Design an enzyme around this catalytic site. Structure first.
Site, short mmCIF file in Angstrom:
data_model
loop_
_atom_site.label_atom_id
_atom_site.label_comp_id
_atom_site.label_asym_id
_atom_site.label_seq_id
_atom_site.Cartn_x
_atom_site.Cartn_y
_atom_site.Cartn_z
N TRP A 110 0.86 -1.17 0.00
CA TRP A 110 0.00 0.00 0.00
C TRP A 110 0.91 1.23 0.00
CZ3 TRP A 110 -1.65 3.11 4.51
CH2 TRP A 110 -2.74 3.93 4.22
N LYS A 141 -13.61 0.18 3.47
CA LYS A 141 -14.00 -0.47 2.24
C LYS A 141 -15.16 -1.44 2.44
CE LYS A 141 -9.29 0.75 1.60
NZ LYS A 141 -7.88 0.31 1.85
N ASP A 154 -2.07 -6.05 8.45
CA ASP A 154 -2.86 -4.93 7.95
C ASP A 154 -4.01 -5.54 7.17
OD1 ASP A 154 -3.95 -2.72 6.70
OD2 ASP A 154 -2.06 -1.95 5.90
#
EC number: 2.6.1.1
Lengths: 399, 399
Positions: B133, B249, B214
């Protein structure tokens, strides 16, 4: 392999949280908590403002996406914030010298400012008043900035000791940051007069300080425009400044984390460069700020009818605080207090130092169920016409 | 005195923001943006989930205050987060080994973890996949932590190169943090199998790494429980770990900034010590987290009917992405692509690397109004049944 966490020393317990626990468990019907940190109305509630509920209903009915905004958040919120701070029509705004990032509260604004300063400037030291908001030191230290104190409150005589303040700041060097509370100084309620603000602004230009104005109570002192006078005196005189602002208190949006960090520079190009680096500081932290509270604020401020409802509510809160300050002084007098407390009606906002010692504070809690924090800070919004007499009788008894 | 901001250099421009600018100025009707970073439905919208609107209505009807919560935010949100991550009947949760702070997004969780580690542990290095990311490096570097890259993706052959991964991690020392994406690896969409996760978890124990998981796409890969398998493989094997989670999300709450940092330690007393210092890191940052999004999530997860509405929507989102992956591959084949894109079908989540060169990406934008980022990362949620044929014709034309 010994655990990475195995040897961590616990952080000290938060004494204020401890007091709140004791208060909750206290079964005495006469208990009163003057140690609280938020506004309360005459019934002891911290309600959602009517204007906020109306705005939230509008958002519920009209929002069609929660897709990310940019690192600076909602542009309309930034513009509304700048107008509140500097005044619509401000030469500062017209000259495009200001940029604002919406942040998670005034706290977030302060941390973003700290990180921005530490990574992009030669600032080594931030000067804060004695006393100041308790969290200032930790925020600036976290970014590697030294925090030094300047003289501010004369606790024995209950005044802002202005001469001591300015002399103590002779130690601040050109390029140091000096932090000033914009209004309703927390925790003293003792604010500079307009003339004093003008003197500080001139001194700041002469000495080369970078002012950081922390404004979290705009509207709680004398009014929205009046409470911005000090900030605007700095804005008139400086090429550069930073403003950390909060909508937690004046919109009753505490838990939504709504505030902003505003940069001002000499020209548009400079503030744009600085702002690009502020964005970078935000990107390395939480990225974009929380939308709900900022949306609420923009919805209220951009609509004449809602804005009027909000302003009236805020006026009502300011006036209740002023009424409680007056009633506290008069009731202490009628209960036979052995000294003068008139300083209370010369102070702005919900906080003042009571002038009580830690021993008197302890006695108030143990013997009388009146709770205040160890510093003697009291929140006058914890007072009501119905609880005023016994809490004043208790105070008189410990003097 | 010269300005503190005068010699600040502009941060380099964000190429993606620039691409979004170009997209907005592009007046051509057939444009397709595969460069977006969020979910979109078949109409090209990023909607508010039905469950979210219902929860927001409930909060509007039932909330009576916005007073501050604690540094860790809403307790029910923390519990619900832990249950999603670790599952019902988790021995780890039964043993009281986990504490969770609600944070402003997964980003906020990563920064809080970074600051906590830097100030309270001997961790010097955080290992992240190549690629990862985009904001990982900036977040960990901001806390003074070195970021190192480990092997992950074979771009030529479209595979998770597992042997390269584990050999490259031989360089990670005991006590280093190793960050793993929990599911739907961003941006490759290539995830370890369960057996591979178990191998990584065993290696991590042997080598003495502190795993940081994560997880930002739980529910977008195979489903909620399946997407947590990797995390749970680590949990089963480790005394300590950190999880940074996001609801941006999977609840479509991007701009509300709702995520969490969960610490796991050997026992309850140890995790309490660690968590006390994590709270101190939060206090020096933004203080309490934004309530609205976390209130929404807790409202949904703690109500069977709403939870079912949420899960159904999420399933529809996951299945739409899977359908677009299949349709993309099938349409490319029917349009005569001179290369096999079957790797797309297997990959998990919204992102994959297309394998397109920067020259092909440039031509797609300039000639066909098809937008991808320079790396060739595409978001398959930018595809619809209606736009698929023109999109694939354009891709075939540049191959």
């Amino acid at each position: 392999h010994v655990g990475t966490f195995e040897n961590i020393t616990a952080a000290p317990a938060d004494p204020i949280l401890g007091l709140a626990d004791l208060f909750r468990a206290d079964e005495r019907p006469g208990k009163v908590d003057l140690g609280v940190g938020v506004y309360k109305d005459e019934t002891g509630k911290t309600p959602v403002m009517t204007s906020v509920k109306k705005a939230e209903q509008y958002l519920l009915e009209n929002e069609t996406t929660k897709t990310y905004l940019g690192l600076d958040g909602l542009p309309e919120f930034g513009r509304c914030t700048q107008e509140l701070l500097f005044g619509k029509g401000s030469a500062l705004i017209n000259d495009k010298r200001a940029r604002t990032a919406q942040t998670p509260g005034g706290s977030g604004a302060l941390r973003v400012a700290a990180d921005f300063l530490a990574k992009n400037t030669s600032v080594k030291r931030v000067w804060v008043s004695n006393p100041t908001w308790p969290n200032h030191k930790a925020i600036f230290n976290s970014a590697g900035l030294e925090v030094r104190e300047y003289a501010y409150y004369d606790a024995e005589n209950h005044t802002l000791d202005f001469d001591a303040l300015i002399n103590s700041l002779n130690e601040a060097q050109a390029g140091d940051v000096v932090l000033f509370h914009g209004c309703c100084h927390n925790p003293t309620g003792a604010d500079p007069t307009l003339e004093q603000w003008q003197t500080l602004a001139q001194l700041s230009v002469e000495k080369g300080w970078l002012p950081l104005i922390d404004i979290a109570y705009q509207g709680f002192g004398r009014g929205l425009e009046e409470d911005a006078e000090g900030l605007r005196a700095f804005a008139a005189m400086h090429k550069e400044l930073i403003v950390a602002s909060s909508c937690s208190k004046n919109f009753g949006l505490y838990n939504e984390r709504v505030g902003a960090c505003t940069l001002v520079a000499a020209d548009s190009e400079t503030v744009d460069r600085a702002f690009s680096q502020m964005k970078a500081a935000i990107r390395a932290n939480y990225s974009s700020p929380p939308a709900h509270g900022a949306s609420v604020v923009a919805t209220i401020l951009s609509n004449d009818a809602l804005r009027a409802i909000w302003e009236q509510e805020l006026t009502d809160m300011r006036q209740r605080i002023q009424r409680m300050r007056q009633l506290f002084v008069n009731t202490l007098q009628e209960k036979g207090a052995n000294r003068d407390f008139s300083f209370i009606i010369k102070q702005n906002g919900m906080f003042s130092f009571s002038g009580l010692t830690k021993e008197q504070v302890l006695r108030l809690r143990e013997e009388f169920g009146v709770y205040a924090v160890a510093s003697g800070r009291i929140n006058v919004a914890g007072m009501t016409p119905d609880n005023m007499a016994p809490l004043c009788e208790a105070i008189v008894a410990v003097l």
